Amino acid sequence: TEKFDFGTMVQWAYDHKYAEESKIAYEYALAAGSDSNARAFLATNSQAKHVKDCATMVRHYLRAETQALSMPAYIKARCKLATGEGSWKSILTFFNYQNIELITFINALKLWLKGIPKKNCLAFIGPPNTGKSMLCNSLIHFLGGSVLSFANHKSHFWLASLADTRAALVDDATHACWRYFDTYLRNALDGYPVSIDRKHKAAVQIKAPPLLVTSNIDVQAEDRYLYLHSRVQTFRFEQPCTDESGEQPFNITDADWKSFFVRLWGRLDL
Amino acid sequence: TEKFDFGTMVQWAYDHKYAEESKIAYEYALAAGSDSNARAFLATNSQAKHVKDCATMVRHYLRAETQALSMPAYIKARCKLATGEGSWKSILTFFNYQNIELITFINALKLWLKGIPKKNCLAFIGPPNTGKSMLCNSLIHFLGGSVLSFANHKSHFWLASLADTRAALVDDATHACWRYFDTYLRNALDGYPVSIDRKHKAAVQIKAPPLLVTSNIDVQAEDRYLYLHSRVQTFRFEQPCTDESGEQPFNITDADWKSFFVRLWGRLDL
Amino acid sequence: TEKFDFGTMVQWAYDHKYAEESKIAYEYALAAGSDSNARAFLATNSQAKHVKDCATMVRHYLRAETQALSMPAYIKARCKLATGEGSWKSILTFFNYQNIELITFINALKLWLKGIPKKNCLAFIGPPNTGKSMLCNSLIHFLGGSVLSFANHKSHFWLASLADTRAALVDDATHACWRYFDTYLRNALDGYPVSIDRKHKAAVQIKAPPLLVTSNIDVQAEDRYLYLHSRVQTFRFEQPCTDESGEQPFNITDADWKSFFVRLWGRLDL
Amino acid sequence: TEKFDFGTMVQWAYDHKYAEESKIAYEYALAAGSDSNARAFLATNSQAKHVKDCATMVRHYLRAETQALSMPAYIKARCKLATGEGSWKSILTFFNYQNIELITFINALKLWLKGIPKKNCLAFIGPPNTGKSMLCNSLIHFLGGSVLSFANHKSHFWLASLADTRAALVDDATHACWRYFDTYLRNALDGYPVSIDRKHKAAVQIKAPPLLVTSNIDVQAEDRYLYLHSRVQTFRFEQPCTDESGEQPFNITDADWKSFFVRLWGRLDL
Amino acid sequence: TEKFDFGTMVQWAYDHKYAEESKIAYEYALAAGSDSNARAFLATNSQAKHVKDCATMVRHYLRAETQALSMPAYIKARCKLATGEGSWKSILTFFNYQNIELITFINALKLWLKGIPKKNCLAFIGPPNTGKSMLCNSLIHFLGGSVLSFANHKSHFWLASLADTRAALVDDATHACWRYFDTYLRNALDGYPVSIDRKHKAAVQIKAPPLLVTSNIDVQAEDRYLYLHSRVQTFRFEQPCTDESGEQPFNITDADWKSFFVRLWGRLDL
Amino acid sequence: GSLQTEKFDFGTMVQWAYDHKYAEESKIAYEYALAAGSDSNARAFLATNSQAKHVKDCATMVRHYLRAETQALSMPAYIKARCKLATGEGSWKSILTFFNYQNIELITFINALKLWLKGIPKKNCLAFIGPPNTGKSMLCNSLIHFLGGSVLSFANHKSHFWLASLADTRAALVDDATHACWRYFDTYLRNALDGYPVSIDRKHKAAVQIKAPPLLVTSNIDVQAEDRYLYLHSRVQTFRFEQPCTDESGEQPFNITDADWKSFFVRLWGRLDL
DNA sequence: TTTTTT
Ligand SMILES: Nc1ncnc2c1ncn2[C@@H]1O[C@H](COP(=O)(O)OP(=O)(O)O)[C@@H](O)[C@H]1O
Ligand SMILES: Nc1ncnc2c1ncn2[C@@H]1O[C@H](COP(=O)(O)OP(=O)(O)O)[C@@H](O)[C@H]1O
Ligand SMILES: Nc1ncnc2c1ncn2[C@@H]1O[C@H](COP(=O)(O)OP(=O)(O)O)[C@@H](O)[C@H]1O
Ligand SMILES: Nc1ncnc2c1ncn2[C@@H]1O[C@H](COP(=O)(O)OP(=O)(O)O)[C@@H](O)[C@H]1O
Ligand SMILES: Nc1ncnc2c1ncn2[C@@H]1O[C@H](COP(=O)(O)OP(=O)(O)O)[C@@H](O)[C@H]1O
Ligand SMILES: Nc1ncnc2c1ncn2[C@@H]1O[C@H](COP(=O)(O)OP(=O)(O)O)[C@@H](O)[C@H]1O
Ligand SMILES: [Cl-]
Ligand SMILES: [Cl-]
Ligand SMILES: [Mg+2]
Ligand SMILES: [Mg+2]
Ligand SMILES: [Mg+2]
Ligand SMILES: [Mg+2]
Ligand SMILES: [Mg+2]
Prior knowledge:
6 copies of one chain form a homohexamer.
Chain A: H1 6-15, H2 21-30, H3 36-43, H4 47-68, H5 71-81, H6 88-97, H7 102-113, E1 121-125, H8 132-143, E2 146-148, E3 168-173, H9 175-184, H10 186-190, E4 194-198, E5 201-206, E6 211-215, H11 226-229, E7 233-236, H12 254-264
Parallel strand pairs in A: 1-6, 1-7, 2-3, 3-6
Antiparallel strand pairs in A: 4-5
One magnesium ion (MG) binds at residues 132-133, 172, 214 of chain B.
The structure holds one DNA strand.
Protein name (chain F): Replication protein E1
Subcellular location (chain F): Host nucleus
Binding site for ATP (chain F): 130-137
């Protein structure tokens, strides 16, 4: 009875960060009890179209709204997202544990986040069960980055994510993987623009984001990976951890990284 | 003369849990004898468009409603749906026949419904005709879960059901299938959110529901499937059901499952 | 006035069981001579949209209506459709000719119509020209079943039929085909619920219907379809159909099957 | 009045049997000089939509207007289309030249036209330049049949024609081609009902029409086409057909086939 | 009012032979300065739809208009397009230079343009730098034919062009190219009607146009191209070109071919 | 009520989007709704019950114009327009110094570049070959960036689509060609090298008969030396970069910017026959 | 959805 206003619903949707049709529809129809517009919505002979468009719009921003930030801004935004309690000390504990000086990682982490040529790829090498996927997965999750599945490597579309995320991580690189790297991904390592295909869409011309790599292989040593030497910052995690006792081993959480970034914000040149 | 009110149809559709076009259309056109709106519906020049949208809208509400519950609230609702007479005894019987203590299955079932990391995968391995498919099938049917079709698993779009159903089932996993699981779905097993891709402009990092699996392969034994050992609870049916000449044997039904949960509600920690 | 009434055309269409655009369009334009509405139709600036939607709408009902019945009820209805004169003896005669005790094909057919898991697939194996397609096709025609066309298996829309018909038939399965079946469709041959993809519509999890396959291959012998053994029932066809005789001594018809079901109704547990 | 009447255009298009957009649009725009409606057409802000729909509407008739007929009726209709002057002698001459009895061809053609199982495929094998395509194309032309380009087999939409025409022709089948046939098209070659996939529309179940195939390969001889034997028939044009004189000695026309059918109408059981 | 007139834009578009959206859109918006309609177009809330439909409309005319001529008529019209000054001697000289009697070329050309089965394909073979692509391209360019890129043959849509032009050219055919031809395109080299798929649109059955091919391989010599012998007319361009100082001693242009045809119209049986 | 003046005007949006060179829906949408604070039309836009469709079409429209504008220009005009774009301060001397460092007479490079830009047959491809770390990609990328060229990624040659860009840019660059790549060139792209038309196939759209633009290639392989690349010899101008641009620690000798090229073209416009 | 992508 009060002519439905799309823009309003979008706003609404956008405010509650509701981005999937299914929800928008439902949640709104609920607010129909105490909301003239919502009520107006259910009156529409085209709820369908709106719910769709509503979402389309919402995500539209959200994506765009994020693509906007700068690494700092972005990392700042990724902090508001971190919920719960923890402390940078946890991270420090671990690195110390691996016999690595946090400053070393910090210094490494500074040029990384900045995507500085030849300082754009961090590798965590070591025997199995040393915390490699741990850390790297926890950091990526924090940063809201994408994990690359080198299994799909057969398809050149296994890099499609690189056109979106701020940070990608290739977990457990094998010789076949490193070879791939040394062969086709050199630019992704020299900060030169690189082409990246997208399912059904046109290729994108972008700068390859920060890369995280875990491997049992010390590329730094193997001679067939020469080009990679100067292009991969390597930390060697040797001391094990996951022991035969069932006990919950270390686990850096979003919170932890929150503290880390918040407390090191000065030193990281952010 | 009265105008066709879409919203009404949707409500109707929603009240009868009529989610598929084919039906909605037919069933409504039937209530056209004693329903002004339906009669208004058949009067429309866009019946098609409506039926379509009607369905779209309904599934919307359903999906949103389905994901809203809590495993318990959900299960509880799945019981109300269970019509007919049966008894938990049928199930106990069979597990016994299969030489397994119900308590074992109950415990495993507990953590499963709770989707606890590493216990989120139930497997029923055994030689042909030992009753794996129905058990699984019957359980999934009761739970209102979806059946994944491995036949389309490339590009993983054989995981889009994963963003909706409270429990899926992989009936008859082949080496090729388990390989796939050991390769891409490790997360659906540890608890870490799985990147459930999908068709239109948006993908969702959803949490994988409990999984059910039937197979002739005993992943626990094979060594190439090491990762899956600690992440797949294996129950094995070695006794044959084959027996079928004359007396029409076993078939677990929604009712049977109703009794099962009702009477084991306490123990299941629901 | 002469405002075109869509709902009318549909009814029309529906009455004559006209479900394909091509026809509906043509046939109607014909009724334009003695029908105000069809004449109105040809007056529409959007006949296209109407023929399309009309059809869509018609199939909509039809499905709903067919999916509604029971197998006997369906079969029963498939009998009303069978016109002409023939007899069950023709069927008997042929099976005898192939040296197969009718009771054997009846007992098999009983559980086949019932779709009991794993007794849902019948294979008619034998050297070329033994009446296999001949038979299968007839029985499928009578049931108004659909043919899957493996040449399209490359498209996940090939099984669409499976979400509509009460019985499907794979005529002349090669090795490639049996391979595929053993590899993906075990949940189908079994006759359990499977997810079917359809163009324009949404996924559909319906119980895979009864299957009929004809082949030069004895999947029961080959150790490579090892796992198709507990699923495919077989009927060997050794004796030749035609052999220097104007017209095939055997050629079963709807009528013949009509007799068959009519006279064998009680034995088939219908 | 000066309103653009769609129905009119359709009639027009239909009368001239103009079924492809390209033409419809062009040919009409020409008649715009002396036709109020066409002129009205060019005035529309949605010519596009019309040309498209207009075509859609025309081929709709044409298809039904065909599938409705009967081979006798259809061939009959194909003769009225045959213009010019020729004589069945020309065809006879050729077949004699190739050293074959006209009663043999006819005997085959009779069954062929009737689309009888496994007697639905005629292959004209022989060395290059023996007039095979020459003959086969001319017949298909007369019959208004469609051709299948194997270069498109990669797409399941290559057989889309089969759901329309009364006769298909595979000109110059290579090994790859026969292999495909022996593997996926036994149904079709068998003139049995195969499901044909079409773009945007759903799969159509129809009886595979009669097939013509020219080939340097005698499937009858080769042993790997063992199963093609009982489905293919075969003719052998062993005698060279093109001469030194620019204009080749044999070149049949519609007229030629007209006579052929008209005079042989009785023997062909039409 | 002066509401945007679609037909006008189309006319404009057509007159300038602007057929791709990208241009039409841009070029029109430019004429917006001195064009009431263009200005009205920019005022449309649906320019998108219009640019598209305009293109669609234009192409239709463009194609329809070309498939509409007779080889003579077409060639005739292609002459009017030929601007500048040149002469057949210039074409001649070259052929003589290559040690080839013009009449030899003319005789083949006559039948080629007529598209007579199996004489529908010319091939210019020879060592690199002998003016093959030179000639062919110039001739295609005057005829206004399209060029096919074997770099795309992995998608049958690389032949889409065939369904439009009156003359196609495969420049620099390699072994893999000839093989593809010997395997799939026998029909096409033969100039018989064939099926041509088109992205999203529907397939068009049409007579393969005249082919021009340049290659370092002499198909008539190789024996694995046995069957391309009766289809491919060969030419031996051996004499190198650009000798000393880069300066191209040969430059064939539209004008040149204009003369060629104009003067040789009689002999070419046009 | 009657007479609306604030009414949402699509064309306006497009112009806006066009001006800022915003071509992707995601952005347009966001960036516009932001300008909604101080923009009657933007505000009108948000008032629309069909923002979706507009964002889409806006975009659709922007590229139409954008793609067309480029293809539109002449090599001169294009390069001219590429200059206005170049911001910052640099100098052609930076480029001279580098080539000099590489022991190559700038005139040599200039003489070739003059013909490259013209896209003249058999001189339509430049290759910068030499041991690793000699500033090849360095130079080539910079030049491509200024020109607004597109980079091809042989890591996708698998699908014939890896060349879709060739239907748009006025210059493409294949960085670090392996043997496999060169073979691919010698095999298929022989027309791209002779100026004769080739059919670029886009995704979901009909192919396009286009004239392959100028090509830039950097590689460790001297196609000029190898014998399995005979055809290429006369179709690939080669520059050998022997000297190591290598910069020990933080302090890069050679860096080349849009500015640097700006000066370069501005000051050499004459000699480049532009 | 078909074309892509597989
Ligand atoms: N998927 C995961 N979930 C939770 N923790 C993980 C996961 N992957 C790795 N970790 C953590 O990282 C450590 C294991 O690193 P690891 O996986 O052994 O490197 P690698 O795989 O090369 O042997 C463990 O201490 C564990 O806490
Ligand atoms: N719905 C049912 N009705 C009657 N019998 C059934 C039903 N489902 C399964 N069965 C019986 O159980 C057997 C199938 O057991 P099955 O599910 O194939 O075990 P598995 O999956 O390990 O191969 C069949 O032989 C069948 O007789
Ligand atoms: N509808 C029919 N009309 C006339 N003859 C038929 C018909 N169906 C089959 N036949 C005869 O039977 C033979 C085909 O048997 P077939 O179906 O191919 O056995 P199978 O399927 O095991 O290969 C043909 O030679 C044909 O003469
Ligand atoms: N429409 C036609 N007009 C004139 N001559 C034709 C025509 N069709 C075929 N020919 C002649 O017939 C010969 C081709 O016979 P052919 O088709 O190659 O038999 P096959 O297909 O078995 O190899 C050609 O040399 C050509 O001159
Ligand atoms: N349209 C033209 N104008 C001027 N010269 C041309 C033209 N076309 C070709 N040429 C000359 O011919 C030579 C190329 O011959 P070429 O195309 O390499 O034969 P092919 O294509 O078989 O390798 C070039 O050196 C060029 O100077
Ligand atoms: N635009 C630039 N700004 C500053 N330094 C650069 C720039 N481009 C390249 N370099 C320096 O040159 C090195 C890269 O040389 P490189 O491009 O790999 O030569 P090539 O392309 O032959 O392999 C880097 O270490 C970097 O310090
Ligand atoms: Cl099993
Ligand atoms: Cl058979
Ligand atoms: Mg089973
Ligand atoms: Mg058969
Ligand atoms: Mg032939
Ligand atoms: Mg050439
Ligand atoms: Mg480099």
